[PDB]
Amino acid sequence: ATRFKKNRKKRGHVSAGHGRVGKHRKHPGGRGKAGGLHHMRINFDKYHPGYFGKVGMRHLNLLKNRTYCPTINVDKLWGLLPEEKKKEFSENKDIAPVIDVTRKGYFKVLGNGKLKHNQPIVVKARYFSSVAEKKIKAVGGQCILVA
Amino acid sequence: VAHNNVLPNVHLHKWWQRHVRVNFSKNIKKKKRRLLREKRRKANGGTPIEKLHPIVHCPTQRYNFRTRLGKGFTFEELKGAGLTPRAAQTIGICYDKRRKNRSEESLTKNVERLLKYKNSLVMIPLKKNKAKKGIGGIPADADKNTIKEFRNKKPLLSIFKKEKNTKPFYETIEVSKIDKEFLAYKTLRRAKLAERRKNRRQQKKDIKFKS
Amino acid sequence: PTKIWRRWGRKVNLKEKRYAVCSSIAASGVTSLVLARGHRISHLKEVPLVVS
Amino acid sequence: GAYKYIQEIWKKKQSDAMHFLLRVRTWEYRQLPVVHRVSKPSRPDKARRLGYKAIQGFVIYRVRVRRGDRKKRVKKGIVHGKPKHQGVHKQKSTRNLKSVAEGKVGKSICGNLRVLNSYWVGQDAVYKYYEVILVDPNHNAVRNNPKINWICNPVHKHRELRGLTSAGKKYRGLRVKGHLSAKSRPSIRANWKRRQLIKLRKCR
Amino acid sequence: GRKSTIKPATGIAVGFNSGHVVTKRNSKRKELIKDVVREITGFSPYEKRIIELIKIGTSASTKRSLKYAKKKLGTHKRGKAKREEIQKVVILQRR
RNA sequence: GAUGUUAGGAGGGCAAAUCCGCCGAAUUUAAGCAUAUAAUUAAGCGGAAGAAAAGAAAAUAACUAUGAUUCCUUUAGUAACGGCGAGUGAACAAGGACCAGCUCAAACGGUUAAUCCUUCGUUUGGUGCAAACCUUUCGACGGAAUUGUCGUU
RNA sequence: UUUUAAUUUAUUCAUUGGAAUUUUUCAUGUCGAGUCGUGUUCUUUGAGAUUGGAGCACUAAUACGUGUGAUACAUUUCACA
RNA sequence: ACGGACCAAGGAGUCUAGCAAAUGUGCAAGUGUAUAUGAUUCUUUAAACAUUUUACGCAUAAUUAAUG
């Protein structure tokens, strides 16, 4: 790795690629994020627009487990289950799959995508989106709330 | 700073060279721990070094569904299994005095686990062919022939492991048994809307019951 | 000054390691490669050589 | 049952009886030397409730300790430094006066003994009084006893200087648990060390 | 949120008593010592002040007694408890 | 109380990488500087062990709940702190290593301190060539202790 | 050489005490005070109408109590210790 | 204008953390098996090998101070 370094290819070039005029000094602009709002303000405003200031109210101790919930959209519910069983449920109209997405690791079912027409499916989840439920019972299925 | 980079964040403004450490001995320590537990199982000679732990449900709604090994069976679980905590702690059964059985499901699952362990136990005499029938729920002492014929059989260490749950994320129902009237999103929204006054009613119920 | 917290080791993808082992076995199976690596195998009957 | 009545009486400290007794004994302590041996506990119930026992190797010492803050140790007020560190008068010691008192006797006055605990005894404008229980780890009455003889082996010498008595536990933040202590449990310095010990795996 | 100790949980994840649907399962010596110690010690001076404020027996004086006890003891809870104990003792001594 | 060159004992000093208390900066960064940072750091004082310290909930959570301490992976550069600037910055859950629980106080025992120590003895068997060491229970003597030892839980 | 597992053998005669659980009774006992807590001051903390500590002033209840539940209050439920 | 009397030997963009871009490689709605465990491997080996059909990171969904 050290023999591929760019400094090696400037070995006899005096300035080491850092300029004969400006030189390579130590912290000529300041240390870290020093000059924001003063002499690095163009950089801060051009690349990190909303950096300065505060917005919103404080949440004192969070406990992310309380509001943790992974989501899944309806268009992946059928792909959750294996191909052969998908074919079985498609060919047979009197049976429907009952999928407990909470077991796969999803807490909320979201409504993005398209479910197969006239293919009933019962979905068990802790939370449901309004459009997710609308699509599920539009294809003849049902949403079951679990906890 | 310059160009379009993330704003730097490095917390190396103290004397960090003193606090950096590298684990050159990760696998050496692996071998040492393996050797230590091998030697302490040869030392007790047949009786496993593992102790039985209960199956408990992980707290919080994140890990609600998952179970794991707790520490210690409860007093109720031990009494359902028929043995006292002091006796149980001499046969490799952990006991903890803090946990309580809030649900019959946990109570019975851990009692069944304890009974399976007890039925799997074969007890060595304290006095070398002076077998007795035990106390505190400890099973009766096995005799020379069964001890000799079981000492060469592989001990089942699967009992000490967290149980494997059957994984039915999939199942089928008849299409005619689908409730086409249920409104899950409306139910969720209504429950959240009504939560406040129902807590009120519960508080008033508690106040009334306190008298 | 050389420090002991140099990156001495490298974490290698398990799939890439398994690929490398499989490819090494495959390469050992072909005669021209075993000849080109430096072994004097002009006189053995077949290169995926197996004995009882 | 007498200890219950003694405890309940001492729970008042503002009654006429307790006020009078505290006045007279504090007056006597003021005339006595700064560290002096007491024949028997002056508060037998409180001593017994702390670790004290009537075994031969248990002794008790009474200690005065000055009140207030100790002032910053600079020569005159001059502190050469930033204004954040220029204060000299409102400097509060980390250790409490009880711990200071037991140090005053356990350091060298009787360095052959082991400090067990200490208790209240009296207050004053300029002094606080305490009685410290000490154990002789070299007495056979202590050594042979299956209880109490934990204090005989080392790792127990100068607890009053390692902050291991009850007063030390109090001022080290070890009298609270959970989110109110959080960062003190294995010791403050050890917890701080662990919280920035940067660990690098060999293979990363 | 609040739960119910009876009437098993609703199987949904939000609202009142939500969650899984598991099966739930459910003086002589003291005041002798109090009497003798009271006989020996009496009342502390601030307790005497509270006693006299209670004995004055107007709403202004009871308010003042609660404020005084609260200042003397710290905390509204301790001040209030002291006031009720002293009112009980004043009634008892009135009998 | 005082006093004893009465009998038997202990402390002191060295050493410090890890460890436990205290005390405690400034350089530095902020492109200046004063809060802040450096840093609960260096220096200074004291105190231990082969580990120390912490430790058996006046703990979490809000769940279908967990269950002493420590450490690792993570939580997480997160919640939060901050001339809200520079900078700083945890906890709970989760996966592991290891895994261990206990006793005083207080309660109860007065047809009887049932406790403990000192000194002086007797034998009970053992491995040493010897030197020494491990076991040993029958006392007696002098004390301590009811201003409370021991047993019970 | 060290120790440390398994395998060798234990049998007779006796009283002395103790222990666990299970039946029948009585009482709900004990439970750490100049301490906790509060105010103020200084420090410390990520801890913010204050995280811990310390000094000073005031100074508790008695388990139906009192302490935690990360925003200061009052009245009060609940949980945990 | 400054440095250089001469010669030899030494002598300066590196190491770690973190982020990104570029490119190569593997796998792909996944990916990385973390700490740790096992296992007739225990000179090398402190590396290789392995992981009883919801650990965690990042990604797979955004947005709002926020109830959501």
Coordinates of C-alpha atoms in Angstrom, one line a residue, chain D residues 3-129:
Chain D
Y3 CA -32.8 -0.5 72.2
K4 CA -36.1 0.4 70.6
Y5 CA -36.8 3.0 73.3
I6 CA -33.3 4.3 73.1
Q7 CA -33.6 4.7 69.4
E8 CA -37.0 6.4 69.6
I9 CA -35.7 8.8 72.1
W10 CA -32.6 9.6 70.1
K11 CA -35.0 10.2 67.1
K12 CA -36.1 13.5 68.7
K13 CA -33.0 15.5 69.5
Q14 CA -35.1 18.6 70.2
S15 CA -37.0 17.4 73.3
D16 CA -35.9 18.9 76.6
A17 CA -34.3 15.7 77.6
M18 CA -32.3 15.2 74.4
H19 CA -31.4 18.9 74.1
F20 CA -30.0 18.9 77.7
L21 CA -28.1 15.6 77.2
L22 CA -26.6 16.8 73.9
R23 CA -25.7 20.1 75.4
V24 CA -23.8 18.6 78.3
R25 CA -22.0 15.8 76.4
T26 CA -21.0 18.2 73.6
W27 CA -19.6 20.5 76.2
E28 CA -17.5 17.6 77.6
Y29 CA -16.3 16.5 74.2
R30 CA -15.1 20.0 73.5
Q31 CA -12.8 19.9 76.4
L32 CA -11.6 16.4 75.6
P33 CA -8.7 15.9 73.1
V34 CA -9.4 15.8 69.4
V35 CA -9.1 12.0 69.1
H36 CA -9.6 10.0 72.3
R37 CA -10.6 6.5 73.3
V38 CA -14.1 5.9 74.8
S39 CA -14.5 3.1 77.3
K40 CA -17.8 1.9 75.8
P41 CA -20.2 3.2 73.1
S42 CA -22.1 6.3 74.2
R43 CA -24.9 5.1 71.8
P44 CA -24.9 1.3 72.3
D45 CA -28.1 0.8 70.2
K46 CA -26.7 2.8 67.3
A47 CA -23.3 1.1 67.5
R48 CA -25.0 -2.3 67.6
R49 CA -27.1 -1.4 64.6
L50 CA -23.9 -0.4 62.8
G51 CA -21.4 -3.2 63.0
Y52 CA -20.4 -2.9 66.6
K53 CA -20.2 -6.0 68.9
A54 CA -19.2 -6.6 72.5
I55 CA -16.2 -8.8 71.5
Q56 CA -12.8 -8.1 73.1
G57 CA -11.3 -6.8 69.9
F58 CA -13.8 -3.9 69.4
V59 CA -12.8 -0.4 70.5
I60 CA -14.4 3.0 70.1
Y61 CA -12.8 6.4 69.6
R62 CA -14.4 9.9 69.7
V63 CA -13.2 12.4 67.1
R64 CA -13.8 16.1 66.7
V65 CA -13.9 17.6 63.3
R66 CA -14.0 21.2 62.2
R67 CA -17.1 22.4 60.3
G68 CA -17.5 24.4 57.1
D69 CA -15.3 24.5 54.0
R70 CA -11.6 24.2 53.9
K71 CA -10.8 27.1 51.4
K72 CA -8.6 26.7 48.3
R73 CA -5.0 25.9 49.1
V74 CA -3.4 28.7 47.2
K75 CA -1.1 31.2 48.9
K76 CA -3.3 34.2 49.7
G77 CA -6.1 34.5 47.2
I78 CA -3.7 34.4 44.3
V79 CA -4.7 31.7 41.9
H80 CA -2.9 31.9 38.5
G81 CA -5.5 30.6 36.1
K82 CA -8.7 31.1 34.3
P83 CA -11.5 33.0 36.1
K84 CA -13.5 29.7 36.2
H85 CA -10.9 28.4 38.7
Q86 CA -10.3 31.6 40.7
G87 CA -12.7 30.8 43.6
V88 CA -11.1 30.1 47.0
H89 CA -13.9 30.4 49.5
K90 CA -16.9 28.3 48.5
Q91 CA -14.9 25.1 47.8
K92 CA -16.7 22.1 49.1
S93 CA -14.8 18.9 49.9
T94 CA -15.8 15.7 48.1
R95 CA -15.5 13.7 51.4
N96 CA -18.0 14.3 54.2
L97 CA -17.0 15.3 57.7
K98 CA -17.8 11.8 58.9
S99 CA -15.2 10.3 56.5
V100 CA -12.7 12.9 57.5
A101 CA -13.3 12.1 61.2
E102 CA -12.7 8.4 60.7
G103 CA -9.6 9.2 58.7
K104 CA -8.3 11.2 61.6
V105 CA -8.2 8.1 63.8
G106 CA -7.6 5.3 61.2
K107 CA -4.7 6.9 59.4
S108 CA -2.0 6.6 62.1
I109 CA -3.4 7.1 65.6
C110 CA -4.4 3.5 65.7
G111 CA -3.1 2.1 62.4
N112 CA -3.2 -1.4 63.9
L113 CA -7.0 -1.4 63.9
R114 CA -9.6 -1.5 61.2
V115 CA -12.3 1.1 60.9
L116 CA -15.8 -0.4 60.7
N117 CA -18.2 2.5 60.9
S118 CA -18.9 5.8 62.7
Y119 CA -21.9 7.6 64.1
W120 CA -23.2 10.9 65.3
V121 CA -22.8 11.7 69.0
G122 CA -23.0 15.5 68.7
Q123 CA -22.9 18.8 66.9
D124 CA -21.6 22.3 67.7
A125 CA -21.0 25.7 66.1
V126 CA -17.4 24.8 65.2
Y127 CA -17.1 21.1 65.7
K128 CA -18.9 17.9 64.7
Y129 CA -18.4 14.9 67.0

